[PDB]
Amino acid sequence: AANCADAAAAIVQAQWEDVWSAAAAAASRVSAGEEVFAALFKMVPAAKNLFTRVNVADINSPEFQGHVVRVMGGLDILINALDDIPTLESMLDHLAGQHAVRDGVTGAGFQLMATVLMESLPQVVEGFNPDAWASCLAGIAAAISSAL
Amino acid sequence: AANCADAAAAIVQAQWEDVWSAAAAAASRVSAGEEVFAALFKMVPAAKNLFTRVNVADINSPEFQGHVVRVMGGLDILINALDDIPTLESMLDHLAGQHAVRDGVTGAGFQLMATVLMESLPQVVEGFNPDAWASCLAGIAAAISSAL
Amino acid sequence: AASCTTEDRREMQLMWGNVWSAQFTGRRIAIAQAVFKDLFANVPDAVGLFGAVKGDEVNSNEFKAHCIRVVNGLDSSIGLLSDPATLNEQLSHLATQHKARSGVTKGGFSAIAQSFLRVMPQVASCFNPDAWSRCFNRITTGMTEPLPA
Amino acid sequence: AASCTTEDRREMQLMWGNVWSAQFTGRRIAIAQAVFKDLFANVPDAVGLFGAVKGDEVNSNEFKAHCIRVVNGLDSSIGLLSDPATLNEQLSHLATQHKARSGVTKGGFSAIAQSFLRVMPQVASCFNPDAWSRCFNRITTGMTEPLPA
Amino acid sequence: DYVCGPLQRLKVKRQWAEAYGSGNSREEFGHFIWSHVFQHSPAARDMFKRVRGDNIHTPAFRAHATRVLGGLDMCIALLDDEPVLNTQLAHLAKQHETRGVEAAHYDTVNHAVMMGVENVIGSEVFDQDAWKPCLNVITNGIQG
Amino acid sequence: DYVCGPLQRLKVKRQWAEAYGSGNSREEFGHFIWSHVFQHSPAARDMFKRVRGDNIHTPAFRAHATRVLGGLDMCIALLDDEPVLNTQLAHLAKQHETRGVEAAHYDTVNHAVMMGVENVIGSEVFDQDAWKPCLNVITNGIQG
Amino acid sequence: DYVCGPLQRLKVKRQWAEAYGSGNSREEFGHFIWSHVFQHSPAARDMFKRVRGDNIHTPAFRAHATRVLGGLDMCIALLDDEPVLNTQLAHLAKQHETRGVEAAHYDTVNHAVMMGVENVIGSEVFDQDAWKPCLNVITNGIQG
Amino acid sequence: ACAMLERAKVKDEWAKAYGIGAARSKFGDALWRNVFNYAPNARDIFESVNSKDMASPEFKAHIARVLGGLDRVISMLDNQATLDADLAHLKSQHDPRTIDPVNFVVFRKALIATVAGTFGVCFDVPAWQGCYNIIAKGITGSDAA
Amino acid sequence: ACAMLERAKVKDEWAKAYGIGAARSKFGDALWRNVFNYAPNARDIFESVNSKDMASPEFKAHIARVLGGLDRVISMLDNQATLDADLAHLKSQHDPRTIDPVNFVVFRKALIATVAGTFGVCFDVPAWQGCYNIIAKGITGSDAA
Amino acid sequence: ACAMLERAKVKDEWAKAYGIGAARSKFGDALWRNVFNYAPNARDIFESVNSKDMASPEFKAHIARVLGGLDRVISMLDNQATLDADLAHLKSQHDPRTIDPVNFVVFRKALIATVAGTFGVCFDVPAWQGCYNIIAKGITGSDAA
Ligand code: HEM
Ligand code: HEM
Ligand code: HEM
Ligand code: HEM
Ligand code: HEM
Ligand code: HEM
Ligand code: HEM
Ligand code: HEM
Ligand code: HEM
Ligand code: HEM
Ligand SMILES: [Zn+2]
Ligand SMILES: [Zn+2]
Ligand SMILES: [Zn+2]
Ligand SMILES: [Zn+2]
Ligand SMILES: [Zn+2]
Ligand SMILES: [Zn+2]
């Protein structure tokens, strides 16, 4: 199960939509991602060698920028399908498979990711709500990482 | 007749309700009463010996506190039935009888009471309106005291 | 009849607000004069009271200015009818301003009042004499606290 | 059951807001006492913790004032549930105020919580134990960060 | 950008009209003004000891403000009639005679009144080059 | 026009009730007050270095304000129970003991709180002759 | 609680967006700011003698404010492009060169602008730890 | 049983139910209709107050008074001191009428109906019966009601 | 006492209160919330039906069944024949659970609250208590309830 | 008679009636419909302004002018100076048309209808007839109208 209260969900939605809607700016989406990873790395540089395939060597490279975006799209997909519990399932399942296959990704690599989004979302979000976010995020961070 | 304008009445209502509604506090009702009498006495101490029956000896006594409350209830009954002119009649008639029988109560003991409420209501009431109040109060102060 | 009721005050307020001119002194003076002219007609020795403001030359600047001040005063009270607490203070002040003038009797007001009653209907639209009276007298009562009679 | 959901907080907020008395200390003390009386009954050595505030004389001014302070604190958190970011700071503060008192165990809260659960339904109108519990425990969790157990 | 000309007067007349409303919000209009006056010159309160200048939220003071704005209304209304205007301004002057109103005091009240007027009618439209000078004409009259 | 009498207390109690709203707008109520406090005494911020007194728009500070108004609510609520009130006032006093709160500081906060209350309930109805004195009873208590 | 980081910039960008509205209320947004500026530093008006700094309620001045906020919009919009930003900041600097703008003057305008922004978007949400530093980046640039 | 909490509660609910203005008249009318339907014979008891015409000012006046009593008493539940004295007073007013205390039970029933009926499913039946009895006892020293 | 009229009446009101569709679920949820608030200890009795989660299908299912019982029984008040048999049946279902009959009193209270709270001031308190008892008696042969 | 008060009043009401914008056109159209129904023969008098088509711009233009005259004159009632001069002017404009002054009476009637009809029962009939005449007199020195 990848759900949280119908309302705890609507909150996250508004907030996420607030910083990442289809109508933002190519530059904003990039920075959110850039920051997310830069932070995800300073926390555990032992993880950099995990994105070698996507020019992680140069975070500002197209290859990597492209990767980052793919991640955002995903988080969006999730956050947004938070109201449709059964679909979010497939959502997760998929992402899970996509990660279980990447040799090296740990079920705690995600724990780190979480801490990062949590420590930096309030920087960009308006009336950020850690509770609603923790309630919905851990719900799916747990589903995506169903291996290792 | 125990009436005042339909509107002059509605005003008093809101104001009275403002300080004495069934949903106040046992402590607030007491103080309004306590003050009303304390003031009613400093004005005419010659009246204290009129409530001897209700432990007026000790204003904070249960017996007296009980009396005070009975008075408030009454004023409430009146103020509130101000819109129904014919019922306020019976209201008055009754109170009248209840007072005409108490040997000592003067048709001016009430005049004093009035002056008291008037000088102290604005202390507790919000946008206190002496006019509306005088117009409705004198209407019934006059009906209750229909003897002596 | 009885007393100046809330309903009455609302009415009083409109009858007045409608003939009132917020930008010029024209109508004010016109009405003020119509009143005084009528007062002075029904009360001979009255004119003798406005010596300080040339009550003889009703078209004199001194008196016009006076009218302006009177009409203003009445406006003050009429509008203040909605806030009796404050009206009381205001009327008390007016009262004092009148206690200070020898010759000003409670009965003088009783007269000017009749005058207004004769004038207003001429300039005001759908005038309500009764309501107006009730409240006018409420304002009077206050203005005339210690005055003789 | 699970966690204090948004819906839950709204509920928690009402159950509380309805028995709350914004103008007097009456009900507050009445409720506070009913709770402590029940806590002290199910946990003997608990009373020994409120020596500084005469926890023996529950009707003592020292303790009443205490109840007032406690009920106030819980009000703070309950209302702050709508703004978790700030709630966190607030609960952290309460946490510190409690880390400073030897004898205050995480399990002590676990108890007082049961007490509230026994009391609220008596004074509160249509009480929702489950929802209340979920959110009460959310507040507890924060207040009791480093406390033993 | 001054000179209370005939046109500026007409303007102030109309804008005053809007601010001095119909006959209700005058309590709040007065409060705003006087409130602002004392926010600038807290000391000024000492001159109004007779009318509860310590608490403008008082029937006593409210009544005072009533008189003030009322006077003000007359002057603004007389603005087009120079002769009668000065006669009135004279009357107002005598009403202040003894009292120690300094020039800076009138500056404050004038400012406050404009603030009050702007507050009600809005910054978009508020002829300052009309109020400023025309208000002075009135003030300088009471000045003596 | 002072003396926090039993009736003035009842009044403050009810008006406080309206201002301290239901349990939502308290964030803005707090903000207004403290905002106003620092607008008057910018220096005062230095006393709140532990709770982000530099930016009141902070969960840290918001939480602080929460505690303050909360304490204030208790005192106002205890106003009718002299004995318990002073017991509490005593507690509050000890909570300030070390901190160098000058008398003028309390005057400011008191003023601010009233502004805050008036802001919400309106100038029409706001018993200043009740808040002023009753607030002092509380302040003078914490005073020590 | 400073450092105009890339995220703080994104924030300021969005909040500025809301305040600088759609293209209407800009007149009032400008008025508020500049109004506040002179309420703090009445003297500052003397620097704007060319654009009716004596009456901000003037097409002349309104036009001025338009230019200012406009410049400000560019800087905030360039915040993410360091290189082009400084190029612009440079241009702005030269536009002030002669004029005697003291550091404290920028502090005031900066403060005012934030007040303006907060006024529109609300105290609940208004990242001060972002505006404060980011605005300085712009100011310190014009500084020279 | 009528605990201090039960009282705070009974008051709370009474307040909500008794209403503010016209609602009170309505409530009163509802209450008494019930009283006389629950015990149609108890009507003759109030002929002194023209119970013949349930809409007569005479009777509405009565209703007014009894409700006022009910209010002032309930509101004082958190003050034994006054409560007892006032209840004692009411006893003095009812003793001479020699009323079968069973009628006060009918009342309790009717009151419950009327208050719950107006207040909602939240109505605390036990708390009401308990505290109602503290009052009935005080007015007609009987069983416990 | 529970007269034939009182029964016709109790049915009439139950019908109005129990409602038609979604109203029934609501009522049930209301009724049980009351039951467990009136006697919080009685909750542990229903752990067999997951009373832990008052919104669990397991429990809603339970509520459904008990309400259905309540309905089929009340509706049969005008037919001793069936009523007795069905009540007897219910007894068979409850006897082995060894339940303190006092709980059935709590229920009566809670039911009154819920029904009156939903039905309105017209609620006939005495008729309900009387006929409710005919059912309680039949289910747990005790005092008279 | 047309006192200074009566004038302040006539103006006040005219203002309310004449309206602000589209209301004026409406009023004008109403007024003239009345004029020509009250005296159908007076229509031929205005063929110079295409009175054939009462909706023709030619005639609407006329209506516009006469109303404008009516307004500028009424508004000047509190200033004999101007009033007389302007009325005199209007006389110069009408004298050469040799119009039977009786028509001006028809007008007065029609005006009263139109203004009272638009203004309301508050309409001061005598004040209007009086002051209307001051204008009619000035435009066609006749009886007193
Ligand atoms: C909640 C945050 C996360 C989401 C939603 C997410 C999403 C994605 C998506 C959509 C892809 C690319 C799918 C594709 O191949 O088409 C991906 C790839 C990947 N993710 Fe994640 N991811 C998350 C967290 C993490 C974390 C914490 C790690 C470990 C530090 C991680 C490591 C990887 C790696 C190594 C790849 C493969 C990159 C490549 O193709 O070379 N992900 N992720
Ligand atoms: C408008 C205000 C007043 C109201 C509505 C009022 C109401 C009442 C009521 C309800 C009672 C008790 C009825 C009962 O015996 O059950 C009462 C009793 C009494 N009232 Fe008044 N009253 C008012 C003013 C006064 C005044 C001015 C006096 C004289 C100072 C007065 C003297 C008494 C006395 C002596 C009793 C008898 C107390 C006793 O039982 O020992 N009342 N009044
Ligand atoms: C009954 C007839 C009245 C008489 C005999 C009377 C007489 C006077 C007199 C002689 C003055 C002094 C004028 C001067 O020397 O400056 C005066 C001033 C005044 N009166 Fe009256 N008055 C009467 C009615 C009223 C009424 C009804 C109002 C309006 C409600 C009114 C408002 C004023 C005001 C505002 C002042 C000017 C105070 C000042 O600015 O100094 N008067 N009156
Ligand atoms: C689990 C049981 C708890 C224990 C054993 C405990 C114990 C204490 C003790 C002994 C004090 C110190 C009293 C003094 O010396 O002044 C205290 C203070 C306090 N407690 Fe707790 N507490 C408990 C639960 C709670 C809860 C749930 C709340 C409310 C949400 C609360 C709110 C407070 C507050 C506000 C203070 C006063 C701080 C001050 O003003 O100095 N406590 N507590
Ligand atoms: C510019 C507009 C002003 C106008 C039109 C005006 C008008 C008035 C009027 C009509 C009165 C009442 C006189 C009476 O009825 O006895 C008054 C009183 C007074 N005015 Fe002014 N005033 C103005 C400015 C000022 C200023 C600048 C100050 C002081 C800062 C001031 C101080 C006073 C004082 C002290 C009183 C006497 C209060 C009392 O009755 O005790 N006025 N003013
Ligand atoms: C008149 C109303 C006032 C009340 C009711 C009040 C109440 C409080 C309360 C309850 C606390 C938190 C104590 C704790 O839980 O540790 C507090 C803290 C504090 N108060 Fe007050 N206070 C008032 C006025 C003031 C004033 C006038 C100042 C300074 C201008 C002030 C300065 C402080 C400071 C510095 C703190 C400590 C902040 C921290 O926790 O770091 N207080 N106050
Ligand atoms: C921090 C934001 C600021 C920005 C973005 C800014 C922007 C501008 C711009 C674009 C112009 C118009 C240049 C032109 O088109 O000729 C201007 C003019 C001016 N600025 Fe600034 N400015 C700022 C702060 C300040 C401050 C702090 C002051 C003074 C307290 C100031 C004083 C002036 C003056 C005196 C002018 C010239 C007015 C004129 O054209 O006569 N500026 N500013
Ligand atoms: C707890 C419920 C009751 C309360 C609070 C109550 C209160 C009152 C009050 C305030 C009065 C009028 C006092 C006066 O004379 O001024 C009254 C009168 C009376 N009550 Fe009660 N009462 C209650 C129940 C009953 C019941 C159950 C009966 C009889 C079935 C009853 C019979 C009477 C009668 C006959 C009067 C006399 C009215 C008259 O003839 O003037 N009361 N009651
Ligand atoms: C007149 C009211 C009541 C009615 C009509 C009633 C009816 C029912 C019905 C229909 C069932 C389920 C039958 C089945 O197993 O298919 C049931 C089950 C049960 N009832 Fe009652 N009941 C009533 C009151 C109570 C009370 C007061 C208690 C205990 C406080 C109680 C305890 C139980 C228990 C424990 C079950 C077992 C459910 C399970 O575990 O499956 N009932 N009741
Ligand atoms: C008091 C009422 C009247 C007023 C204020 C008035 C005003 C005017 C005005 C302003 C004009 C046009 C001036 C111009 O040529 O620029 C005009 C034209 C005219 N009026 Fe009147 N008028 C009034 C009544 C009448 C009446 C009663 C008649 C005849 C029954 C009349 C017949 C005419 C005619 C024939 C024209 C000539 C229009 C043309 O052919 O151009 N008017 N009037
Ligand atoms: Zn200012
Ligand atoms: Zn401005
Ligand atoms: Zn201030
Ligand atoms: Zn104020
Ligand atoms: Zn500022
Ligand atoms: Zn702020």
Tab-separated table of C-alpha atoms and ligand atoms in Angstrom, chain E residues 31 35 56-57, chain F residues 118 123 126, ligand 14:
chain	number	residue	atom	x	y	z
E	31	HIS	CA	-10.562	57.595	15.007
E	35	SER	CA	-5.161	58.043	16.164
E	56	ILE	CA	-9.676	58.398	22.025
E	57	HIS	CA	-11.871	55.321	22.316
F	118	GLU	CA	-8.173	46.276	18.733
F	123	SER	CA	-12.093	50.401	17.358
F	126	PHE	CA	-12.545	48.103	22.570
K	14	ZN	ZN	-7.529	52.913	18.317
